[PDB]
């Protein structure tokens, strides 16, 4: 699709806010990394950028970029974004703020693509894995293994399933808003907004103060460039700080959740599980750290812990109600004794 | 290039096979890494891509790309092409579908072109290694330290010293190979092969045949989509299944097999051959594992096993008729008995 | 970009240079990378390449890159050039023999324009401080808490803030420099050059000489193929040799020295401090290491080293004299009590 929810894209416009560290002297650069979010354990991580690439703030084309570069936007193509993580990542489509991306899992994540007159990079932490929820956790993107229950994102991008709040935004530089009032220095509006402001010298900076401009000061880089979109809400980053004096509702979703069906998964590389004579052999050979652990069915309680993520030959006692063995997130397989090692006498010898 | 092994090289056609990771951790592409080949102790990788880069069809140039975009192929300049394993390799010659490259090491293996109608890259886990030749123990070797004889793959092309069976090739997806004749599901070749085609329904299905074939049963996944080659090659692979019945004879050679070169190569920073009274005190200051290792010259075996990665005077004592001491894959070093204590006189004036 | 200090530049030519690792098989560079100055602690590294970017020969601009092809220079754009660490860096500006990059955090340099089918890219390793003298250690100085000094390097060029020692252009590889005068070894210059001579063939075998050349023995290969311009003055690279005969020493600076800025810095998320009677409680938990260390005061020393990053309370025994708490190489802050644990009011001796 292009259009799955003018709820984002229509009231939503983008913005260029700081990066948290590009190492040019830290770059002010419009993919100012905010809620990374590898919480999809699938292959997938969705990303948001501070700008709003997708459709430009219209209807037509994810294949755009909107980004801010002064107040105004700059709608070129999506393929001059490049989110990456370790290796780079594939776009697998853009809603709003938030792109959805097929990336190699990381505890960091990097995007970057040239723009002012630096390389105007981005960098953020946030932990990723793609982890089976369960008694197991794991890297890489699926590639092996069986598939068992764990997160993994949507491709719509259509979801109220949550919502960030938007509601009321505020201010991120862009002193090109910031125009001179025949000496003094001039709040104006992105592409409307009611943009607050103050200076170094005094100025009204509570209740409405798009009316207001500091009349006292002359120097631009003092002064409170603003955008509360309140017809066009932005997401409400930390390098986007808000307003103070007004209010606005205008609360605008997300388009992707991690949900949990049967994600594409790993499960690490077949135990053998046999029984013999009141005891479960088990030759275990992982890769991704298993936790295999028991609950010795019966009147029996008996758990075992033990994270494997070395190949061992552990031993389980089964008991005659049986022993359980959950090796990781693979559902609980069971084991019933008696033996198995076969034969015990019990009968009348005639064969 | 060379046509000396035209065996491979010049019978040989672009090859169609699944990407295990990619755009949804999942791609169609024509490339997926088979036979990562980390078995040198050097530098370099011998890989085959399916895509068979070199020529075309002809016989010139090493330096053109042909990968699968349907069954044809797409014979462009391989200026798109980006072999890189973790980072960039640099390319060493391509003959058949085999590249060999001085790569970095890496865990993986990352080529991509976009060239199809996606982002139309592959990435794939596979093994890669370096170490030294016997003794110490290092992944791909320094920078400094004395060359020795490692395996290393070719600086050439069109060679042979191994042979890997590349016994027919065949069946592989992709639905131009099955496409219709206007009513039945008709089997296509690359540039002319034998192909043993059939269906679900009944037919023959062994034989050297090209005689063989099955429009009974209709649709593109109730066939078999081949390219049984026998005269345009591709080395064997996984995600190329070979028709059910009997091979087609094909074993060919490698063009790329491990030769002896001067490889930069695994030798921490110098040793020094102490001696005191019939013990080598052993002043060492490596930098990388060393396996050093002595042996008393006896009749006495003195295995020794210790990594040296400490700066370390360390102690072997010497037996009375030497001991050899062999610092790494680095030279071995021997020494007589008879004491020492580095020219200390024993008694010296004359009878 | 512009150029000031001639000193460097017109009294300069690049000289080409070897990389000393650039993969398994080494690429060529004549940006071969000697003295790293990468050891500000804050982030941004200064790299000497072999090249003697600057001028091209003219009067203007560091804009241009003059690098070495053949004996003679390559004087195009800079811009090419591409530092970068742990992502890519910005250029600030080049000097002499010197380019400087404001960089995200990195313990090494990577500098490098492509030129040809190679890499063409050089790599150094280099001892880096991430920290001021005294306690603790930073492999990328935090942006998260405090800042307090950090060595970083300019965001321009001119500045002669210290000084190397350097002599001339010394001896370069590359047969560019010798001909052949029909049955003489015959030395050609392309910046003028007093030239320190000698062959295989017995004739001055020292070398220590003006401007000579040996006739003895002719071929490229078995003379000296030198290039000492002595109306030249530049640093000394290791991969710029010299000549046996005359130096020209004389110190001249460098353009880029470490000084104190914005730099993210060398402290992690501060202290939280509680107090109980005569000993710190201190829950502890920054971003990154921090090498703690105390000094129960008064004649008490009391000594301690731990390493904090985990979250954990510790203790350090505050005496009636006082105790500083030493939260990394930051100056010591300093608690005294009797009495903390929230207050005693009394109507008794602590009530």
């Given at each position: 699709d292009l259009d799955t929810h003018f709820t984002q894209y229509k009231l939503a416009r983008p913005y260029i806010a700081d990066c948290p560290n590009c190492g040019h002297s830290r770059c002010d650069s419009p993919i100012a990394i905010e809620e990374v979010r590898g919480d999809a354990h699938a292959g997938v991580i969705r990303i948001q950028t501070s700008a709003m690439f997708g459709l430009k703030t219209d209807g037509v084309d994810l294949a755009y970029m909107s980004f801010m570069n002064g107040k105004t936007q700059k709608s070129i193509k999506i393929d001059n974004l490049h989110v990456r993580t370790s290796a780079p990542c594939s776009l697998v489509s853009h809603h709003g703020y938030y792109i959805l991306a097929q990336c190699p899992p990381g505890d960091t994540v990097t995007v970057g693509f040239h723009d002012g007159p630096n390389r105007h990079t981005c960098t953020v932490a946030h932990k990723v894995e793609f982890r089976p929820v369960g008694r197991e956790k794991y890297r890489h993107p699926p590639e092996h293994g069986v598939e068992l229950p764990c997160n993994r994102y949507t491709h719509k991008r259509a979801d109220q399933g949550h919502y960030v709040e938007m509601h009321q935004p505020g201010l991120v530089a862009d002193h090109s808003l910031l125009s001179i009032h025949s000496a003094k220095v001039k709040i104006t509006v992105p592409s409307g907004a009611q943009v607050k402001y103050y200076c170094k010298c005094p100025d009204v900076r509570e209740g409405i103060t798009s009316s207001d401009h500091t009349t006292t000061c002359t120097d631009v880089k003092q002064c409170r460039a603003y955008?509360?979109?309140?017809?066009?809400w932005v997401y409400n980053s930390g390098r986007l700080p808000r307003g103070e004096g007004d209010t606005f509702k205008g609360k605008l979703h997300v388009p992707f959740v991690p949900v949990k069906a049967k994600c594409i998964a790993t499960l690490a590389p077949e135990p053998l599980v046999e029984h013999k004579h009141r005891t479960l052999i088990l030759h275990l050979h992982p890769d991704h750290p298993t936790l295999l652990t028991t609950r010795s069915l019966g009147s029996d309680a008996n758990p075992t812990r033990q994270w494997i993520e070395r190949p061992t030959t552990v031993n389980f006692t089964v008991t005659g109600e049986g022993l359980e063995y959950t090796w990781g997130n693979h559902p609980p397989k069971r084991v019933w004794a008696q033996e198995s090692g076969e034969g015990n006498p019990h009968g009348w010898p005639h064969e």
């Amino acid at each position: 699709d292009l259009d799955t929810h003018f709820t984002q894209y229509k009231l939503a416009r983008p913005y260029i806010a700081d990066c948290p560290n590009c190492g040019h002297s830290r770059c002010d650069s419009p993919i100012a990394i905010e809620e990374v979010r590898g919480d999809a354990h699938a292959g997938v991580i969705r990303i948001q950028t501070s700008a709003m690439f997708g459709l430009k703030t219209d209807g037509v084309d994810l294949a755009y970029m909107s980004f801010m570069n002064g107040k105004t936007q700059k709608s070129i193509k999506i393929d001059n974004l490049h989110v990456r993580t370790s290796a780079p990542c594939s776009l697998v489509s853009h809603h709003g703020y938030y792109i959805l991306a097929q990336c190699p899992p990381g505890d960091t994540v990097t995007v970057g693509f040239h723009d002012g007159p630096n390389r105007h990079t981005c960098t953020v932490a946030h932990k990723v894995e793609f982890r089976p929820v369960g008694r197991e956790k794991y890297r890489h993107p699926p590639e092996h293994g069986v598939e068992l229950p764990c997160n993994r994102y949507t491709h719509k991008r259509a979801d109220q399933g949550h919502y960030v709040e938007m509601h009321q935004p505020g201010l991120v530089a862009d002193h090109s808003l910031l125009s001179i009032h025949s000496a003094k220095v001039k709040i104006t509006v992105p592409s409307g907004a009611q943009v607050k402001y103050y200076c170094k010298c005094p100025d009204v900076r509570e209740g409405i103060t798009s009316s207001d401009h500091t009349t006292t000061c002359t120097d631009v880089k003092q002064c409170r460039a603003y955008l509360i979109d309140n017809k066009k809400w932005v997401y409400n980053s930390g390098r986007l700080p808000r307003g103070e004096g007004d209010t606005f509702k205008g609360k605008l979703h997300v388009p992707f959740v991690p949900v949990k069906a049967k994600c594409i998964a790993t499960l690490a590389p077949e135990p053998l599980v046999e029984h013999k004579h009141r005891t479960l052999i088990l030759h275990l050979h992982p890769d991704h750290p298993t936790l295999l652990t028991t609950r010795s069915l019966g009147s029996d309680a008996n758990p075992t812990r033990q994270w494997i993520e070395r190949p061992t030959t552990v031993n389980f006692t089964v008991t005659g109600e049986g022993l359980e063995y959950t090796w990781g997130n693979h559902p609980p397989k069971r084991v019933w004794a008696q033996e198995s090692g076969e034969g015990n006498p019990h009968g009348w010898p005639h064969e």
